[PDB]
Structure formats: C-alpha cells, structure tokens
Design a protein around this ligand. Sequence first.
Ligand code: HEM
Ligand code: HEM
Ligand code: HEM
Ligand code: HEM
Ligand code: HEM
Lengths: 306, 305, 305, 305, 306, 306
Amino acid sequence: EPEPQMVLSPLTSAAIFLVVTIDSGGEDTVRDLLSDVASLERAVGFRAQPDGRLSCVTGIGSEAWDRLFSGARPAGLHPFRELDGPVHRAVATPGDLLFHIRASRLDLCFALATEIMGRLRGAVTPQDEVHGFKYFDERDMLGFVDGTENPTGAAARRAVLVGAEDPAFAGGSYAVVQKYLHDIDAWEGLSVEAQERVIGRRKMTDVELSDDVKPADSHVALTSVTGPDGSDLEILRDNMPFGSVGREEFGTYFIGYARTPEVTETMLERMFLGTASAPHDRILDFSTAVTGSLFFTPAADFLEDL
Amino acid sequence: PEPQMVLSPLTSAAIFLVVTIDSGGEDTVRDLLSDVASLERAVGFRAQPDGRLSCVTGIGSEAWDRLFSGARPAGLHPFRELDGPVHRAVATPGDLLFHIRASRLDLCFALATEIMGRLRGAVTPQDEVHGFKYFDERDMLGFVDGTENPTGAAARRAVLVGAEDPAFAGGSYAVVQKYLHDIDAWEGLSVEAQERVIGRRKMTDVELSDDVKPADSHVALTSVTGPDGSDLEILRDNMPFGSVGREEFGTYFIGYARTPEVTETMLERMFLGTASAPHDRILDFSTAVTGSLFFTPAADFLEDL
Amino acid sequence: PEPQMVLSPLTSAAIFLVVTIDSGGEDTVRDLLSDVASLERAVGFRAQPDGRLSCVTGIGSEAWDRLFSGARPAGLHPFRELDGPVHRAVATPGDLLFHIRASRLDLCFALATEIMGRLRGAVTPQDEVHGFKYFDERDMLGFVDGTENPTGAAARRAVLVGAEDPAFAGGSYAVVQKYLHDIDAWEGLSVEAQERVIGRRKMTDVELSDDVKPADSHVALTSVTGPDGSDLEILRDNMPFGSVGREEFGTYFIGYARTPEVTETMLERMFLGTASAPHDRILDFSTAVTGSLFFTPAADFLEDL
Amino acid sequence: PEPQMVLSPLTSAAIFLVVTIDSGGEDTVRDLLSDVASLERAVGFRAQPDGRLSCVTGIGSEAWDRLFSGARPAGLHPFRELDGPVHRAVATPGDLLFHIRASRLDLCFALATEIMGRLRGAVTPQDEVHGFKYFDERDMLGFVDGTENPTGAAARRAVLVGAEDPAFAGGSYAVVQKYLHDIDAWEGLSVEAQERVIGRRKMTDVELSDDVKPADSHVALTSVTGPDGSDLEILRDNMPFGSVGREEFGTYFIGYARTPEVTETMLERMFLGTASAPHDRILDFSTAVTGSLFFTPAADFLEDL
Amino acid sequence: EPEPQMVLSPLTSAAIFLVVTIDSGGEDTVRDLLSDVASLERAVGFRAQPDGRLSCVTGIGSEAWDRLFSGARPAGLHPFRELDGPVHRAVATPGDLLFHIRASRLDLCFALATEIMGRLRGAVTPQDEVHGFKYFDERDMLGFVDGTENPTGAAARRAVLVGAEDPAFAGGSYAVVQKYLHDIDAWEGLSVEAQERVIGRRKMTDVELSDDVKPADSHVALTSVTGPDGSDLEILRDNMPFGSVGREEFGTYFIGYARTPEVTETMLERMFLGTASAPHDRILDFSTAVTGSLFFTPAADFLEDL
Amino acid sequence: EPEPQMVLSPLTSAAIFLVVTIDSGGEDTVRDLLSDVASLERAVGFRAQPDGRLSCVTGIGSEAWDRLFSGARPAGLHPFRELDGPVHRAVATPGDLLFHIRASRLDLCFALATEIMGRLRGAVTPQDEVHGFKYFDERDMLGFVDGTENPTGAAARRAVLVGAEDPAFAGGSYAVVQKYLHDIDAWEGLSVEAQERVIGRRKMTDVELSDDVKPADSHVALTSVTGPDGSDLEILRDNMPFGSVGREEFGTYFIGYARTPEVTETMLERMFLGTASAPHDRILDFSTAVTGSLFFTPAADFLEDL
Ligand code: HEM
Ligand code: HEM
Ligand code: HEM
Ligand code: HEM
Ligand code: HEM
C-alpha cells in the first residue's frame, strides 16, 4: 500500500509556501534532497512533539518531472493552463518544485524551510515565498470564513488521492497554487449584504445562503460542480492569508488538492470563463491571481525510494 | 456507511434539545435534517482546532412513522415506562433529539440557535439542558462518571448497528433520561455508605471488591453478561446540570447502544430489580423526570433526504 | 482598605444570584457574609492557577437597614424606576447580589452551591443567570461588548469609593438589569443599520466617526462628560445568557461605579432621552425585566461582621 | 487481539517500576494482572481529555512459567548479559515491568500507588525511576532523542507480534536498561566531537551525511538491515531521570520490538562492536546498571485471567 | 526600596528542594555562587518565558551565616530548635544552604539545580534533595487540598517580609523546612469523616468545619494562632508532595515563610507540645518529621552586592 | 499621575514593526491618528482577551516632533547619530513615527497595523515593515537565547522610564531601532566554541562565560557598561527574529528602550568604535545594520490629551 504525503491533514495556524525553479545542472542535487525531505521533516518536527504539527508536502511540476525522472509519468501532469477570460485571466507562472510547509508555529516552518533551501542553494532559483497566518476564526482577507466545505474522512480520501485510475502513481495528488491579491478598497465599498451575495454565505455566521437568494455568479454557486454521474466534485483547500500593510498587499494564497487536475481546472474554468448563467465569478472582481502553477505530489514512498 | 459522531468522547459543554414535531411540520423537519451536517460545519469550522463541535441527531419511533415511508430500524420503539414497586421510569414525549457537544458552550448555543431558527413553527420544545463538566469528570453525587465506557474497537462493536440490520448499519440507539437528585438526603450519608450505593470508591474511583460490593449497588446492577459469556456494554455521555436557587441538581443520562435491548435490560434491573436486589440504591436519591428513545441514523442517511 | 474583586476582568463563565432575605433570616445572612471570603478560597484554591474564581457580594438599601446599625453608604438607595415615554426601566426586589466569575462554570456552581446551602431557609431566590462568553467577547446582538471599560488607575478612580465617603472607602455600587432581546427584529436590520444603533462597526469593533455616529446611538447616549470635561466611566461585566427553546436571548448587565449617580445618569439618558435623542435605539431591541442597585463593601467590612 | 499501549507516543512524565515476585506471590499477582486495565481507567478517566495515562505491563521469562500454564511466547528468555572487552551489558532481576506514562506525574504516581497497594507483601521492588521530559525532547547528553522512531504502519510491523506466533499476536517484547552518564567527561568534548559520537547535529537534530558519519557513531551502529535489505527498527520510549545531589544523570532505556532478536542484535553491535567499530562510543559516557527483558501480552490476555 | 527574592510567589506544579552543608574551606566558592545565583536563574528561566515561571529562593542557616559574613546578623536567625514532645519529636538536622527551586516544569528546576551544584562541587555536601510535584487539585498525600488559607496580597507581604524592625535586612524572610513522611496504610484505614476530624476541613470540598464540630486537636485548630493584637498570625506555605512507591515513601515537604521565626515556632510548639486542650496535633499520628532546618532568605540585592 | 505606554511589557511571540515618514502636509492627519491610537488598540485587542496580549507603542522622531508640536521638547530627543567605525558603520535612516506592535498572535498585530495605516494613507510614506516571530526558546537567528539580561520589576522602571530629570515628559522612554541582517553562511562555519567567544555566553545553556575566558571583544563584554557611580547601565530589549529563506534574509530586529538615549548610544559606540582593548564587537563581523532610528515614546496620556 503506498503511503501518501500529508495532503489530507488539516489547516494549521502557520504555513510557508515555497516555489522554486531548478537551474540547469541542479537535477542531481534536487533528487538527493527529495530522498531526504521526510528525514528533514522528522529532524525538526520531533523537537516540538506533541503540538508542533509540522508537515511538508513536496510537489513536482510537469517540466521538472521530465528533467528528473525517466519512465511513466502521472496521467494528468501538465503545466498549469492559462485561462484567458474576457475580463479576468488566470496566469501561468514558473515553478518546478513546491514545498507546502505547515505547523502550529512559524518557527518550525522556518527552520524546516531553512534546512531544505540550505541543501538546494546553487541548484534552484526561488520564485515565490509566502508566510501564511491564521486570521481570527479561520477568516480570509475578505473577512469570510474560508475552508468550511472541505471534505473530511473518507470523502476527502476519495476526492484527493490518486487510485486505480492511475495505479503506478496511487497515493499521489495534484496541487494547484495561485497567489491572489485583493482590492480591499473596492471590497470595502460594498455593504455586507452585497459581499454576502458575492460569496454565497453569510459573513459573520458562515451559514450558506438559501438556494432562492444565492446568486448564480456567487463564488459558492460557481465552484459547486457535479459530475456526469451526479457525484459532487470536491477539492481540499488549504488557503492561507498573507500580506504587507505598508505595501497595501492583502492576499489569499490558494492551494487546492485533488486526485485529478480536471476537477480543479473545471472549477477554474467556471470562475474565469463563466457559464451560460454567469459571466464570471464575482470574487474575481476583487481578487487578482498573480501566480499559477500545478504540481504532482507523489506518494511518500516514491520520494524515499530515490 | 459513515456514522454520526456517537463514538466521540465527553466534552466540557453540551446542549441536549428534545422537541416534538407539530402536525404539519414534517416537511420543514425533513429539510432541516438534510442540512444539519452543513450547519454543524458552518459553526464548527470557525473554532478549529479546539472547538470539537459535534451534533448527533436522533429520531423517535412515532416520528419515524410520520417522516419516512420505507423500512424501520429493527429495534426502534417508544421508550417503555417501567412501573417498579417503589420507583418509576416515566416515558415522556420526544420526536427529535439534538445532542450537541463542544469544548465551549458558545459553539453549542450557536448551533442550537441555527437549528431552532429553521424549525420554528414546526416543532414544540420539550426539554433543553445545558450541561457542564464538573471538576474531574464528576457527577452531582460527587463520583467520577463514565469510567467504564468502552473505547476503540470495543466501543464500535457495542454502539454501532452492523450486519444484523444492514440497511441501518452505522446507526445507533440513544436513550435519554433527565434525573434530579435529592442532594440533602445524599449528603446525610457517610462517604462509605455512598460508596456502597455506587460500588466504587469516591475520591479515587477504584471499583469495590466483589467481596464488599453490594448486590443492589449501581455498578452491580448495571453489570450485565450475555449468554455468550461476554459483558454487554453501552456508551454513556452523561452530563451534570443544575440551578442552585431552585435546588435542582441533575444528571442528564444519555446512553448509546447498538440495540435498545441492552440499555433496557439495565433499566429493568435498576427499576424492577433482581433475585438479590429490590432495586438500584442510586434511585433512592435520583428521580427520572424524562424518558425517551431515539435512533441516530448514519450520517449519509440524513444527507440523502 | 482591601476592595472586593470589583476591578477584575471579564471571564468566560459567571453566575449572578439575587435573593431576598426572609423575615427572621438576618442572623443567618450576617454569619454567611462573614464567611464568604473563606468559601471563595475553599473552592477557588482547588483550581489555581487558572481558575480565576471570584465572588463579589452586594447588599441592597432596605437590606442594609435590616442587617447593620450605624452609618449607611452615602449613595445607597433603592433602584429608581424610569418610566420613559416609550421604554421603562423596572425596579425589582433584591437584597443580596452574588456576582460569581471564573474561567469554568463548575467553580462558579460549586461556590454558589456552598453559599446557598448556608442560606437555605433564610432567603428566597429572585434571579439566577448562568452567563457564558460568546465568541470574541460578543453579546447576543453580535457586537463586541466591554471595549471601552476603564483599566488601571482610571478604573480604580471610576469604581472605588474614596475620601468622599471615608467609612466606606474601597466599596463600589453595582447596578444590575437583566435584558431580553428581540433577535427576530434585530436580524431584520442590515449590518449598517445595526452599526448606527450601537455606534461601532460590527465585525471590527472600531467606533464610528463623530460625523456619522447618530445622536440616539448607544455609544452616543452613554458617553457622558463630567463637570471638568472628563468622561464619566463605569466598569461593565455584561454576560450573555439564554435558552434556545424559549427564544430567550439575553444580556445580563452589571455595572460598577464609585457613585450610582453616574450609572443613573446614563440610564436616564437611555430611557427618558434628551433634547437630541428620543431614547437609546438599543432599547427598541432590548427589554429590561429586572433592575436592582447594591453596595459592594470593602472585603474587610464583611470579614469583621 | 487488542494490544496494550505499546505504540503510543512519548509523554512528559513516566514511572518505570520493576519488581520480583516473592514466594507464594503468584495468586496476588494474577489477580492484579486481571485488574490492571480497570485500575488504569479508574485513575485515567479523571484527567480526560489531556491526561494521556497508560500502563504497559510486562512479564519476564522465569515469571511466565510461575504464573501461566500452556504455551510460552516464542522469543521469551532471560536477558542475555554481554561482557564486552571494555563495556558490559549487565543482567539484573526483574519479573514484572510497569511502564506508566502520562502528561503529568500525579497520574502516574496515583496509578503506581494503586498497583503497588495490591501487590504489597507479594513483590519486592527492584527499580523505580521517575522520568521527565527535558526541554525539546532531549536526553541528558543534550541530544534530541526519539527522532527516528517508526510511526504508523511501520511501527505496527516493527513492534507487534503477528502470525509468526499467533497465540501471542498483539504482544511485544520490551528490553529495559538503566544508564548513568559521565557528564563531566561528556562536557569535556567539543560540541562537534559529541556530534561525531552520536551521528546527528546537536542543536538542530539533523543527521550527519554519510560522508562524515563515523562508523563507531551511535546512529551508525544501531542502523541494521535484515537479509531482505529491510531496516530493522525498534520503538524507544527513553526518558531522562536524575538526582543532582548524587551526580546521577541518567537515561532510562526501554525499547519495544516484535522479537527480542532485533534489540539484541543492536546491543551486540553496541557492546561487542563490528569489523569497523570496537564498540559504540556512546558507551564511553554511559554505564548500564540494570538489564531485563519482558513480554508485554495483548491486553485481552491479561483481562481473561 | 529592598527587592525581595520570590518568597511571595505562588505554588507551582514542580519544585526541587536542595539542602547542603558547606564543607570546611568551601566559603569562598559559596560566596561567589551566591553572587551569581540570580544570573543563573535568568540564564535558564528566560528560555521558557512566558510560562516557565522559574524561580529560586536561596536561604542561609545560622551557623553558615557567621562563616560567610562579618557584621550584622538578622535578629531572628538561630538554629532550628528541636522539640521533644512526650510522643512526637521535631528533629533538627544539618543544613547551611537552601535552594527552593520552583517552575511549571521539572526540567527547568533540574537544569538550574544542575548549574548551581556544578558551581558548588567540592565545596558542599548534599543533605537532602526532594523533587516535588502537584497532586491533582492542589492536594497533599493525605488527600486534602493544601495551601487554601495562605495569605495573599498585602496580607502576605506583611506576614512574610522583614521590615523596619530589622532595617538592615528589610525584604528578607525566614524559611523553616521539614520533610514529613506519612503512614498511608494507617491513614487510609480511617473513614473520610475521621480524616476530616484530624484536619479540620471537609475532604472533597475543602470547606472548613464549623467551630461547633471542629476538634481542639485538629490540625486547623492548632495552627490557628491569634497574636497579642487579637489578629491572626500567618505564614506562607509552599508545601509539595513527593514520594517513591517502591519504598512506601509518601511525603509532604513542608516549607513555611514568615517575617519572624517566632510565628512558625509557636505553631510547631502547639503541634508537637500541645495546649491545655490538646495533647498534640492528630496530624502527627500519621506524619513523621525526618528533617528540620531554619534559614534566612535575604533580599535579592543582598546576595548580588557581595 | 503619568501612565506610560506599554514599554515595560514582556516579549511576545509575534510583532510588527512599522516605521514611516510624515509627508509634507501630513501633520494634521498624523495628530488625529495619534489621539486615537489607544482607542484603536482597544478596538482590536479586546476581542482577544485574555490571551491576545496586544499592545502598540508609538514613538516620534526628532524632526517630526518639531513639525507636530509646539512648546517643550524631550531633553534627550535628537536624530540617530551615525557611527562610522574603521570597519563597521551604524547607518542613520529616515523615520518619523514608530509603531511597535506586539501580541501572542500575528493576526492581532496585522489587524491593528491595518487600522493605523488606513488612517494614515496619503499622510505618510512607509520606510520599513518587519513581521517578527519567536524562534524556539527565545533564540535569535544566530542560535543564541536573546534577552536574558533584560531588567525586570523596579530595576526596569528605573532603567526605562523618564522621571524627575524631565518632569514634563515623565513616563516616556527612548527607543532605538536597528534592522540587522546576518551572514549565516559565515556564522555557520564557526565552531560552537568560537561562536560562544563572539557572544560571551554558552550557546545551548545560555550561561554566561566566566570572566577568565570571556573575550574583551565579545558582545556581552562590550555591552556591559558601568556608569561613574559604578552601577550597570541597563536597557530593555525587545528584539525579534525575522527573515525570508528564499532571499537568504536572516535578521534580528533590534529595539532597545532606555530612560535616556545616552545609555544606548554608549553601547553602540563601544560596539562600533571599540575600546582600548577591543577594536569592535565581533558580533558585527556577522551582522550588518541596514536601518537606524531614534524615537521618543511619550506617556500614554500625552497622546490622548491631543
Ligand atoms: C480568490 C481567492 C479565494 C477566496 C478568498 C475564496 C474564498 C472562499 C470562501 C470564503 C468560501 C466559502 C466557505 C468554504 O466553503 O470554504 C469558498 C468556498 C469554495 N471555494 Fe473559494 N476562494 C478562493 C479561490 C478559490 C479557487 C481558485 C477555487 C477553485 C479552483 C475555489 C474553490 C472553492 C470551493 C470548491 C469552495 C466550496 C464550495 C462549496 O461546495 O460550498 N476557491 N471559497
Ligand atoms: C442518576 C443517574 C446516573 C448516575 C448519577 C450514574 C452514575 C454512575 C457512576 C458514578 C458510575 C460508576 C463509574 C462509571 O463507570 O461510569 C456508573 C456506572 C454505570 N452506569 Fe450509571 N449512572 C446513572 C444512570 C444510569 C443509567 C440509567 C444506566 C443504564 C440504563 C447506567 C449505566 C451504567 C453503566 C453501564 C455503568 C458501568 C458499570 C460497570 O460496568 O462497571 N447508569 N454510573
Ligand atoms: C441591552 C444591554 C446592553 C448591551 C447589549 C450593550 C452593548 C454595548 C456595546 C456593544 C457597547 C460598545 C462597546 C463597548 O465599549 O463596550 C456598549 C458601550 C457602553 N455601554 Fe452598553 N450595552 C447595554 C446596556 C448598557 C447600560 C444599561 C448601560 C449604562 C447604564 C451601558 C453603558 C455603556 C457604556 C458606558 C458604554 C461605553 C460607551 C463609550 O464610552 O464608548 N450599556 N454597550
Ligand atoms: C545509552 C543511552 C542511549 C542514549 C542516550 C541514546 C541516544 C540516542 C540518540 C540521541 C539517537 C539519535 C536520535 C534518534 O533517532 O532517537 C539515538 C538513535 C537510536 N538509538 Fe540510541 N540511545 C541510547 C541507547 C540505545 C540503545 C541501548 C539502543 C538499542 C538497543 C538504541 C537504539 C537506537 C536506535 C535504533 C536509534 C535510531 C538509529 C537510526 O536509525 O537513525 N539506543 N539514540
Ligand atoms: C546583531 C544584533 C544583536 C544580536 C543578535 C544580539 C544578541 C545578543 C545576545 C545573544 C545577548 C546575550 C543574552 C542577553 O543577555 O540578551 C545580548 C546581550 C546584550 N545585548 Fe545584544 N544583540 C544585538 C545587538 C545589540 C545592540 C545593537 C545593543 C545595544 C545598543 C545590544 C545590547 C545588548 C545588551 C545590553 C546585552 C546584555 C549584556 C549583559 O549585561 O550581559 N545588543 N545580545
């Protein structure tokens, strides 16, 4: 049985997201580090038993996969697909390796990131680094509770882990990342009731709007997708807030895990390109994506066996 | 099948709500049942990771027949009043049970508010108790309460319906009784005399030897063996409650079991007695003022309505 | 002079008990008053360092005359009923107040049990509320409640009797009112309209600017400048309480001040209005169902009798 | 088969008790063994949810034959003394092991008190150590200790007896050794020299790379592969202990494994060395003063007595 | 203003009590350590802020004082006085220095004890070392809540700290220590109600027995002492449980702080020698003192300025 | 009478440091914000009682003081003095207003910073923003415990608050800030013993090196200063780590409070210009100051009485 990485684990109060590209000639250094990442996680993490909750999920992009490995590839691994809507665009930006590092304290995340990057210096170029923090009662920078309808238990396993559809890569997952910045000035121009209509849930109490008042171009409406067989298509989101007050940067770092990119891409298409009933997701009128990358997060034993 | 959170541990706060369904309110109730898990997530997610909010929803026998057209769970029936020579276990109205737990009362109250907001005009409240942890898991009689609950696999076996009733697998049966205690009488006993009523040491919670443990002690009467030698177990999530001004010192009893027959066997022994015991001595200091039985279906049963 | 714990912060749990003294109950009460500090330590020491148990004991005007001869506190009088054009602040009976707080309800309940056990047959309960923290220090209207309470030296100056009444230095005066809210009406307002009722932003708790704050908003009416230009302040320890099944969503108001005149001035503005404001708009959603005044003596007063 | 809590994590407090069984003590011991799980619950339930009390009970080779008729676990034998050219792994008496862990020492102490109370007059104590967490999971040599323990499925595979000995499935083997350290000699080494003794970086706990890791380093010598190319793993629940007055700075070693052969292989490598290492350098600063081997049966084996 | 040592600080969950004698010729070593002890306490303690709560209170015995210092001695400092009752005895045992180390965790206590003893090695001989631990809800090994009637606030300051009566030593205090071992076998044979009559309070609830039921030879009656002024004489007790289950050692480590030894001495005299109304304190029928020592704990500035 | 700002408060797990300049014409907006900052601190902080521990200390620079206020100036207020050593330089950088925001959680800090900067938009220009985090057991990025010798209690009050020497500004303090970046690659090539000789304390245990082995150019030797009266000159440090792993930015944000800037300036002179026995503080061989500013932090009531 393949052991997954920690893709099913819960939100934490601190996170570091690091995205790098692999420099020409840096492949051997990267493969050696991949084989040791679990050992590094334990080395740091054991220090803060029992409440540290340190984990690291490592993802590899399509272009990078083909530079690192030979043989079969995961069935759905491709570069992030840029979505060029009439109004809003989802950009593709460079990224070969993702390290999604979580803990209950930032120091543990920082210590592990330090160890990883120490091993990679001179082999990679950093592309993005975000230090995420919990904001009040699991809110995002738009002031709404964010993560509520994540799947749990068996449903999460079924939504997130590769299975018999791609048996050589069972136990893996696909992660899509996008860094979003928000236009807080425009957002705060809206009444609370108008913001609720953009999201599709009540702001303070986080209760979903009734189907009779929920707009068709609300975020919740557009990201609710059912498959041809009537099943709900779900993803697991580990979004974190971030920002810088003096630069007026207020962001949401989006990261979504799913057993095939087709689920997450369907959601993104609905948001950016719209449906017969909605031109686009109204959340995008206040949110700009500035990065966009797709990664395969292999089963943990795949990494170990390097 | 995914169960509701019937296996989850005791918490520091709880709200127990029992309502009856008004004639005409059935549709509203089915709508609400389909959404209860949603509402739980809406409130609970706000307080990850330490909130530990849960809600277990149960449905009574008469309500079942009013709400659903298909098969009935095999063990589902009205609570059976037990008319003992001295003490009585009353059967009181209740169609729907919401057993709400969290580490803080606010989460319980917020969720209860949302549930009741959806049911207003469809149901009549019968009982509402706000329970609280009392020191080191003590009840209002001063004893640790819940010690011999089953855990892990033993709990699953004792609590969850399985292949004996396969269309309802993952469900469970809850019996509730609200008890009020006569604390004046109880406090007139010595500690040793109280230990003989319960069957355990008061301060340390160690079981009395079989040599010393009276036949009519509570632990003796609620220890039941099956014909296959094995102990019959239930999972109890009792909480204290009360009002000092009204001299109300209570234990809210709630017991979960894979069949009601187990919890009914224990109640029979308590109230009706055995060869060796007229009745459970705990009932000399405890009066049951409610009594209701519910089936708590698997979570996917409620979602699919 | 050692004050009672009138300056201590909000806690997550409280019990408020208000009783009247039966005729012939005086001596039993006096004996209890002399022991209440001892009882608080008896229970509270069990939960050091985090229990934070306290009990503040207050005595009403009529009761004062029944219990004690000699000097009366200068400001002590029965709560004054306020009969406004639309809203009324009722005066209800109460001779003794016990304001019990802790970080856990069990500690409060244990202490209340001890106190009432010592008073049984000498007093009659008038009110009992069990308050709980609601999210991030919110009240049942959904606003952060207590923000502008004074701290440090400013609190001491606002709350404790000093040289103006030297025999009773270190005392304070408490006004209590139990309020029930009309949540259905309140929830009919937009958040922006709610903010204009209160005078602060709802989610972020920032005060509205003076150019937008309505004259009949709550913050506007309860901001009162004294003879010297400075704000007259009180210390509020309001707690939410309620019952979902009875649709009872409440705020237990308790405010401490060095003279009742401050609190009474605020009440008059709220209920009777001013030239600028008909009445406090919070009262269009909030009904007072009790109203009592108490003097809370210095701790050494109680210890000596 | 329900295992005892041999797979559970390190805790901040522990008591290790080793005793021998006196003449005629067998019946008393068998009665205790049947009740030990009940005693754990008695104490443990008091400190839900965070007490994390557990007790693992082990029985030695000679004791097994005195207590039980019928089959013996395949791997149970007396601890094998190893007399190396420089260092010795001593064997000392021990019939019963109690490995008691919790998040607080009180819980461990209370359970140990109850156990020893039942055994008074039937057993002679041989060793008692009260262990405590030291900073960030450090040992008395200043190194993080426990990092490479197996977890999850790998831990089950490494620790629990399976189909190779089916009557005893769910059991495990525990080896204990009390080590005292020469802290003066240790503190005479540079940090970098200490890291070469252990095989990991001192502050950050990162393993030295293979190019730099000495062959007589502790991590090198206790890394063993079976013929399959499989890593042989044990689960260590080591705790620091000591007495400053007596200059007693210790490590209480306890390691669980599915067969004693794994742990014995490691001890042989440490004490007797390999082709490339005379002995483990950790032993130049560490002296074993006890050594015993126990079998820890499945929990239901004990309950069935 | 004299700065006291942490003699007013509350009970903690962990404690080490160390008593040593000063070997011949060890005086200079000890004086240097005394000047450094606050610095050692910060060196260890700062690592664990804000919740470590580490403190160390250093005391010096009467004989040791004369060996260490010339000039003024504190007025109340003398060797502990042996009390030879008809039945029970309070023994006097050697002790020149006391270290009363407290924290929320035993590691901090142990680390600081280690640094202290490492500096005193070869200059001192250990006489006693006890590792105390909190037992449930502030109970002692007899199962009673212990510490309830300790003074707080200004009442504690008045009771504990030397003031104008000995101005050269203002902000000091006096500590008496006794290690007690209990006969738990005998104690656990009593009914709870009989135990309550020994102590003077309710066992489970910790409420004081009323005057009309409390026995004259109960512990609470014998340790309640009114001064000339008709006011209560008070001490501050930081008693901790300790023991070893194999040796049947179940102990109370008594430590009591007071502004003058006369207060603690009066209490001990009542307990061990009794009154007109009581032969002795019934607690002593289940408790044997095996050490007894008296220390002065100077103001912190005294130690640093030597 | 005078209530200080929270300059005596302890270290917390999270901090934001914001330094801004006041734009031409920004003065009135700033004065209005200064009068409201306490109300904003309460608006956010009350939400998180009792464990949020939110505070904000507001400082004003020398040039800004004269732009903002008429009448008396604090006696010690002047621009930060650049120190140009032979090897190392302490740079002076622009800064009119300092907001030192601390809490147990970063969200509270970020929320309050957001409210302050929202009021100042168009009136100020940000110069520096640092989000500090606790690193293990109060360590800095050099791996040493940092803060140990801070004064406490009465000694802190005396070291930090202005008193009768400047009675109009009694209850204020002076803050010096410097953002340091560390050369961790160079630092990590030193043995632990060599690092200990740079700092002047044992790395793991934080015990001070004895006076025989402590190098005269060690950090602790150079920042140990006695006044003419023989007494130690003390400051209160609230230094926090910060960093970005991808940029290899590993920093110490230095902030030191004192009753007069002369104390802190003497320390800086010793560090940067050295003594007869030490060319400069060895810590500076691994640490570069990239900001340097001096602020007066007035009593709370001074800000309010605007
Ligand atoms: C731009 C920043 C984003 C923000 C601030 C945001 C915020 C939210 C919020 C507040 C909710 C409702 C509560 C919850 O269930 O989590 C929500 C739901 C959801 N979001 Fe987003 N979201 C963002 C981007 C995305 C993206 C890019 C996707 C998909 C690619 C996505 C997929 C979802 C899904 C599947 C749900 C659950 C809908 C349901 O089944 O009820 N979100 N998000
Ligand atoms: C006044 C109401 C009740 C009180 C205060 C109470 C209290 C207790 C206490 C103190 C114990 C011993 C510790 C423990 O194992 O939990 C106990 C055990 C138990 N009670 Fe009750 N109980 C009550 C009602 C009931 C009822 C109505 C039932 C069953 C219908 C029940 C079933 C049990 C069971 C099964 C045990 C475990 C006995 C054993 O296996 O040792 N109890 N209860
Ligand atoms: C229905 C009952 C009440 C509710 C729900 C309520 C709620 C609030 C809220 C939300 C605030 C703003 C935040 C704060 O500073 O605490 C506030 C402020 C205040 N309330 Fe009330 N309150 C009630 C009754 C009263 C009463 C009866 C009094 C006085 C007799 C009073 C006096 C004050 C005062 C003095 C302030 C501070 C105003 C300022 O200076 O900004 N409140 N209340
Ligand atoms: C003498 C006292 C002992 C001390 C202080 C000690 C300390 C340590 C330390 C610091 C580590 C490295 C971190 C870790 O992975 O836990 C380690 C690893 C280990 N120790 Fe020891 N140990 C001792 C005795 C033993 C004994 C007696 C055994 C086996 C019979 C043992 C088996 C192991 C194993 C298997 C590892 C993991 C090696 C690896 O796979 O990396 N240790 N020990
Ligand atoms: C590179 C920036 C800095 C780092 C990493 C740093 C680190 C340290 C460390 C590790 C200590 C020893 C433990 C302690 O007592 O806090 C220390 C002490 C000290 N530092 Fe620094 N420091 C730095 C800059 C400064 C600056 C700029 C000053 C003064 C202007 C200063 C003043 C002090 C003082 C007064 C002490 C206490 C000395 C004693 O009395 O023992 N430090 N610092």
